[PDB]
Symmetry: C3
Subunit: 119 residues, 3 copies
């Protein structure tokens, strides 16, 4: 075809989709961040059969837990789809900490990843 999508083309696409200025991801989730007022919001997707736990305290941005979480929901589980911080900015290099879970089993694994400037 003489031209190809890069393997991470989804980052470019979803940063545009959400008008995001930062993003963060691992093999198991991704989140696209927008700054506004004194804080920030992330639109969140699961990856690799995993998702982010909605349990309060399981997520930290620069050591601060989100003030609100919206989720997709089920009889036994729920997965983060949006999370917000009232007073913490998204910025390059700050750490998002999380528990990742999978609907396949009852596992829960600690993870962390650093925010990157949107392409």
């Amino acid at each position: 075809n003489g031209v190809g999508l890069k393997s991470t083309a989804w980052i470019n696409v979803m940063c545009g989709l959400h008008n995001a200025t930062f993003y963060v991801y691992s093999s198991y989730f991704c989140a696209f961040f927008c700054n506004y007022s004194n804080g920030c919001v992330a639109y969140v997707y699961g990856r690799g059969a995993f998702y982010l736990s909605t349990v309060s305290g399981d997520i930290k941005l620069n050591s601060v837990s989100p003030n609100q979480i919206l989720a997709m929901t089920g009889g036994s589980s729920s997965a983060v789809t949006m999370m917000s911080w009232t007073s913490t900015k998204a910025a390059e290099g700050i750490s998002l900490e999380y528990q990742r879970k999978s609907l396949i089993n009852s596992s829960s694994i600690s993870g962390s990843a650093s925010l990157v400037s949107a392409p």
Copy 2:
């Protein structure tokens, strides 16, 4: 690099993703419309730290409120992910009126935008 994704490549991708024939957006939301039978459905995403309020009485497509809204939900908030009309069609140039909200500061702001033909 010789070739580049347009800044609005997400429009192309997400219209294809939902097989949408019309879409609408601002800096703060986007919605991808499919016509079917006598009405239409939009698949909805937030942008720029905002999202669409799930108050159907506050959304109007060609002056008519959707009768169904499916949402991502949380303790005190919820965001539109799909909304439908029984008897109103999506077409280019017709107006979507809506209320946009942000989890960061609990802002609620009226907006309006015109539907455009999918690329």
Copy 3:
């Protein structure tokens, strides 16, 4: 413009987004599958004004019902956004049976489609 996205570029992008190795779709839904441990997870999107029913018994992968379904919700209605199998793998050619619905007129129709390797 010399270069163009294929009409099915959303397949490449969404498989990348969720780090999926298989996918499946019709005019009315798509689903992106990841394998992990002994089972698999699909991240699900509606198409063409339809969505996948969350009703128990309505979904089979290789003749097995999912152990969990997460949903976008509203009133008593809900649409699959993520679904999993404890013990069933995604693999090329295996059959997903489902019930597709639309909010516009409450249609509910059975269908099936075969998994395809991610590009």
